[PDB]
Scaffold this active site. Structure first.
Site, short mmCIF file in Angstrom:
data_model
loop_
_atom_site.label_atom_id
_atom_site.label_comp_id
_atom_site.label_asym_id
_atom_site.label_seq_id
_atom_site.Cartn_x
_atom_site.Cartn_y
_atom_site.Cartn_z
CE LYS A 1 4.13 2.33 9.70
NZ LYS A 1 3.92 3.75 10.09
N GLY B 1 7.45 3.80 4.25
CA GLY B 1 8.23 4.88 4.81
C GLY B 1 9.67 4.53 4.46
CG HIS B 2 12.41 6.71 4.86
ND1 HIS B 2 11.32 7.44 5.32
CD2 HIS B 2 12.85 7.27 3.71
CE1 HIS B 2 11.16 8.44 4.47
NE2 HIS B 2 12.06 8.38 3.49
CG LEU C 1 -2.18 -1.03 1.01
CD1 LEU C 1 -3.10 -1.04 2.26
CD2 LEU C 1 -3.00 -0.79 -0.29
N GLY C 2 2.00 1.16 0.68
CA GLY C 2 2.98 2.22 0.76
C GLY C 2 4.13 1.82 1.65
N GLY D 1 9.32 1.45 7.82
CA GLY D 1 8.01 0.84 7.86
C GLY D 1 7.42 0.61 6.48
CG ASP E 1 5.11 12.00 8.12
OD1 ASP E 1 5.73 12.75 7.33
OD2 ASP E 1 4.93 10.79 7.91
N1 LIG Z 1 4.94 2.97 6.27
C1 LIG Z 1 4.17 3.69 5.86
C2 LIG Z 1 3.16 4.63 5.34
C3 LIG Z 1 2.20 3.96 4.38
O1 LIG Z 1 2.46 2.84 3.93
N2 LIG Z 1 1.07 4.62 3.98
C4 LIG Z 1 0.70 5.95 4.52
C5 LIG Z 1 -0.57 5.76 5.39
C6 LIG Z 1 -1.65 5.12 4.52
C7 LIG Z 1 -1.17 3.77 3.92
N3 LIG Z 1 -2.28 3.26 3.11
N4 LIG Z 1 -2.47 3.45 1.73
N5 LIG Z 1 -3.61 2.93 1.41
C8 LIG Z 1 -4.26 2.46 2.51
C9 LIG Z 1 -5.53 1.88 2.73
N6 LIG Z 1 -5.93 1.54 3.95
C10 LIG Z 1 -5.17 1.73 5.04
N7 LIG Z 1 -5.38 1.49 6.39
C11 LIG Z 1 -4.27 1.89 7.10
C12 LIG Z 1 -3.32 2.38 6.26
C13 LIG Z 1 -3.87 2.29 4.91
C14 LIG Z 1 -3.41 2.66 3.61
C15 LIG Z 1 0.10 3.97 3.08
#
Ligand SMILES: N#CCC(=O)N1CCC[C@@H](n2nnc3cnc4[nH]ccc4c32)C1
Length: 281
Positions: A44, A20-21, A17-18, A23, A131
């Protein structure tokens, strides 16, 4: 049974989903039945130390209860994973470029209110987020947003600010002067990052209008190590990010009140709420 305890054997990775550095957040299915009918959850974890950091982020999220804060679901256990509700629309960075037609000014001002309420709730529990960017704002629906990450979130002592030790991956273009210069972090410093998030929201998170792309034009993209010091001068002079296209002056003034050089002379989250709510009436 503990409904907040997720077993590793049933927690199935779908996609990223995403990150950090240190995480990363992934889309998983928690499937105890084994028939792919289980729920989709956001997970996470650490990128393979930072266990202590992730553990503190977990304990902070576990105890925040607000409609504009992503819901804690539980943990997966010396290693640990944070389980949260999954929001399919992702962050504003994903959502906004794809939904410009659906999301008019009135809806952007409602998202702005929702960010401020979630942020004000955070301030009230004596935490500085550190952040606040559109990439950390999740989209629950067309009518609701949630703060979706607490990776840099710190408690404020007694004191008015948290003092920063590690700063090497600081989102500098979202940072107030007191953060870039002294490394102090007040609630008013999160107000500054809200102003920058509001700018992103109004420009629908377009890459070319990003607070970094814009600030790198105002200073130069070829300054390497000197970027921050050059950025500190700009703000010292009095230069701010421009008014977004089609943004009403009344909206841009509420934004400028987030960008006062001095933290004590900055607007509050409550004032922004009242200010946005008056424009919506
Ligand atoms: N490590 C880190 C940060 C990270 O991965 N993200 C920033 C916070 C949101 C994260 N993300 N992106 N799509 C998402 C859909 N449902 C989610 N529920 C919790 C986070 C999250 C999602 C993606």
């Amino acid at each position: 049974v503990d409904p907040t305890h997720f077993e590793k054997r049933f927690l199935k990775r779908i996609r990223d989903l995403g990150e950090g550095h240190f995480g990363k957040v992934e889309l998983c299915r928690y499937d105890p039945e084994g028939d792919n009918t289980g729920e989709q959850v956001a997970v996470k974890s650490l990128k393979p130390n930072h266990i202590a950091d992730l553990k503190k982020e977990i304990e902070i999220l576990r105890n925040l209860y607000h409609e504009n804060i992503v819901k804690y679901k539980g943990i997966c256990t010396n290693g640990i994973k944070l389980i949260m509700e999954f929001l399919p629309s992702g962050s504003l960075k994903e959502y906004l470029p794809k939904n410009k037609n659906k999301i008019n000014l009135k809806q952007q001002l409602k998202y702005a209110v929702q960010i401020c309420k979630g942020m004000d709730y955070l301030g009230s529990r004596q935490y500085v987020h550190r952040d606040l960017a559109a990439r950390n704002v999740l989209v629950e629906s067309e009518h609701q947003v949630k703060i979706g990450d607490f990776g840099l979130t710190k408690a404020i002592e007694t004191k008015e600010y948290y003092t920063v030790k590690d700063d090497r991956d600081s989102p500098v273009f979202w940072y107030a002067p007191e953060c870039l210069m002294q490394s102090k972090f007040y609630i008013a410093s999160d107000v500054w990052s809200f102003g920058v998030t509001l700018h992103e929201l109004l420009t629908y998170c377009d890459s070319d209008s990003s607070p970094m792309a814009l600030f790198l034009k105002m200073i130069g993209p070829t300054h390497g190590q000197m970027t921050v010091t050059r950025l500190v001068n700009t703000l010292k002079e009095g230069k701010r990010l421009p008014c977004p296209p089609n943004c009403p002056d009344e909206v841009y003034q509420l934004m400028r009140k987030c960008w006062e050089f001095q933290p004590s002379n900055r607007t509050s989250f409550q004032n922004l709420i009242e200010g946005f709510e008056a424009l919506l009436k």
